[PDB]
Amino acid sequence: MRVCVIGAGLSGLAVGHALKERGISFVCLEKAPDVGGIWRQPGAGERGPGYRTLHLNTAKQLTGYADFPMPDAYPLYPRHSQVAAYLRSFAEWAGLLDHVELRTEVVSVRQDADGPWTVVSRGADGAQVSRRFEQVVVASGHHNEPALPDPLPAGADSFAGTILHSLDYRDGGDFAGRRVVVVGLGASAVDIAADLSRHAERTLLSVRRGLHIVPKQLFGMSVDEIAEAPWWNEMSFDERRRWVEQALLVARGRLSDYGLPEPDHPVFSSATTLSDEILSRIRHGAVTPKPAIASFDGDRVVFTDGTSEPADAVVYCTGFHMTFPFLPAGCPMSADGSVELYRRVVPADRPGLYFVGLVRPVGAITRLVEAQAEWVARLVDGAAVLPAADQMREEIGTYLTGIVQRYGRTEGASIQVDVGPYLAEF
Numbered sequence: 001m002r003v004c005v006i007g008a009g010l011s012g013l014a015v016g017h018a019l020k021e022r023g024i025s026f027v028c029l030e031k032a033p034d035v036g037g038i039w040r041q042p043g044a045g046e047r048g049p050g051y052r053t054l055h056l057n058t059a060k061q062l063t064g065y066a067d068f069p070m071p072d073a074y075p076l077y078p079r080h081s082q083v084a085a086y087l088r089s090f091a092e093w094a095g096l097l098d099h100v101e102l103r104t105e106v107v108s109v110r111q112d113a114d115g116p117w118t119v120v121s122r123g124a125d126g127a128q129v130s131r132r133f134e135q136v137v138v139a140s141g142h143h144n145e146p147a148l149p150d151p152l153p154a155g156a157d158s159f160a161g162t163i164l165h166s167l168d169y170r171d172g173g174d175f176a177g178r179r180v181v182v183v184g185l186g187a188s189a190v191d192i193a194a195d196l197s198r199h200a201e202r203t204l205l206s207v208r209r210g211l212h213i214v215p216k217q218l219f220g221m222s223v224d225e226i227a228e229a230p231w232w233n234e235m236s237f238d239e240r241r242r243w244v245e246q247a248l249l250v251a252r253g254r255l256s257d258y259g260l261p262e263p264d265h266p267v268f269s270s271a272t273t274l275s276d277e278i279l280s281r282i283r284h285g286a287v288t289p290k291p292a293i294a295s296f297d298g299d300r301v302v303f304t305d306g307t308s309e310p311a312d313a314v315v316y317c318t319g320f321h322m323t324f325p326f327l328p329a330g331c332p333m334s335a336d337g338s339v340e341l342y343r344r345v346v347p348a349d350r351p352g353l354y355f356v357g358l359v360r361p362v363g364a365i366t367r368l369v370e371a372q373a374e375w376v377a378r379l380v381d382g383a384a385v386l387p388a389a390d391q392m393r394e395e396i397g398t399y400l401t402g403i404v405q406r407y408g409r410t411e412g413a414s415i416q417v418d419v420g421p422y423l424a425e426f
């Protein structure tokens with residue numbers, strides 16, 4: 001009755017733990033046949049952002065729940081199978097599954113003038129049920145709808161091949177002996193180009209802009225334990241900026257010597273993509289750097305420098321869009337490309353709705369959602385309160401009108417934060 005949680009992923013298990021530890025009645029409605037979120041989906045053969053060779057890029061001790069450590073025989077980056085098995089055994093140890101409805105998809109959420117929210121869910125039977133709930137916590141995560149190129153390049157209609165997104169990619173063993181263009185330079189592109197390159201006959205990597213490809217580790221320490229190390233923090237910014245530059249050139253030299261465009265923005269201003277494989281796949285010819293895709297000329301794809309290439313498939317690793325389809329009201333947005341959420345969680349106009357996990361930090365999100373979960377628990381039963389509406393909107397306006405200075409206008413810079421001082425406020 002008290003709290004309807006949408007999402008049994010990492011973020012929704014976390015919030016369910018935090019209400020349970022306060023004694024608030026709640027349910028997690030999850031659409032998937034088990035808990036775990038995206039990490040469950042490779043190994044269930046299901047269309048999700050992950051793939052079979054997906055691993056963590058954050059340190060296990062920094063990524064597992066601070067109350068429930070990951071198995072110690074786990075490596076610093078476990079596989080998607082290892083984490084999704086860790087999440088479920090977490091749900092077991094917290095006794096949350098009795099409060100979990102699996103295979104139940106929230107189809108709409110509406111606020112009633114009395115305060116409670118009516119929430120209609122769809123079961124495996126295709127049947128729908130409508131229920132009222134005192135508060136609602138959104139925990140559905142923002143990598144849920146595939147983001148395509150704004151126009152598909154010309155002739156895509158008659159490509160005589162197979163054009164897909166990172167969500168529909170699974171093993172690559174499905175691409176054994178074929179010819180694939182990977183479109184992207186993000187965490188999903190580098191990973192998938194390298195998965196092909198062991199299965200594909202030829203593996204191309206089309207890129208539009210240069211990104212700062214960085215190894216998972218420097219000095220033995222992963223890039224996430226460095227941003228918690230006292231030394232790193234005790235240095236300024238320009239001390240850190242050239243610190244990494246020297247380390248990256250000593251570790252991988254110049255990206256231009258791999259066929260990759262040089263970033264138009266320096267490390268810390270141009271998204272970093274962490275890989276320990278791609279450059280060494282270029283240097284062995286297993287993946288071949290390309291520019292943008294210009295056309296689909298028959299059974300081949302034509303690139304912007306002029307080259308042709310026979311291609312049986314193209315998997316677009318072009319990102320994802322943040323959609324919240326069950327809120328007819330509109331995702332908490334500003335229309336300049338920005339989120340409307342006091343402290344990245346609370347909508348100012350709607351009492352009783354929280355958003356857990358709609359943040360993008362450097363490194364693991366886990367502690368951020370642990371904090372968001374504990375604060376939303378004391379908001380529900382009144383052991384914490386919020387400013388007035390207008391004061392909430394002043395915090396949100398300082399956060400916007402600020403992400404333009406450390407960052408800039410773009411896409412989704414509005415769910416972005418530092419780890420340290422954000423969690424300092426808890």
Ligand SMILES: Cc1cc2nc3c(=O)[nH]c(=O)nc-3n(C[C@H](O)[C@H](O)[C@H](O)COP(=O)(O)OP(=O)(O)OC[C@H]3O[C@@H](n4cnc5c(N)ncnc54)[C@H](O)[C@@H]3O)c2cc1C
Nearest residue numbers: 007009010011030031037038049056057105106141357364
């Ligand atoms: C490919 C990929 C790799 C990543 N790798 C890392 C990594 O290595 N390290 C790291 O720290 N972070 C990583 N992340 C970030 C990642 O989002 C978090 O690790 C974690 O998955 C948090 O997910 P979440 O619980 O917020 O939501 P998600 O796990 O994204 O999904 C939440 C759940 O909500 C459910 N849901 C959605 N809509 C409904 C509905 N209407 N009704 C019912 N249920 C619904 C979904 O089925 C899902 O189970 C990665 C993300 C992606 C996409």
Ligand SMILES: NC(=O)c1ccc[n+]([C@@H]2O[C@H](COP(=O)([O-])OP(=O)(O)OC[C@H]3O[C@@H](n4cnc5c(N)ncnc54)[C@H](OP(=O)(O)O)[C@@H]3O)[C@@H](O)[C@H]2O)c1
Nearest residue numbers: 055056057149150184185186187188189209317318319320
């Ligand atoms: N643990 C892991 O190893 C792992 C694996 C996968 C994902 N993740 C995480 O999960 C999220 C998934 O993001 P993602 O991997 O999809 O990467 P992303 O950050 O969304 O980047 C997608 C890539 O597509 C390019 N692109 C965007 N629009 C394009 C267009 N219209 N045409 C062509 N190319 C275009 C971008 O180029 P530009 O940058 O130049 O715009 C970028 O290189 C990220 O937060 C990532 O860190 C982690």
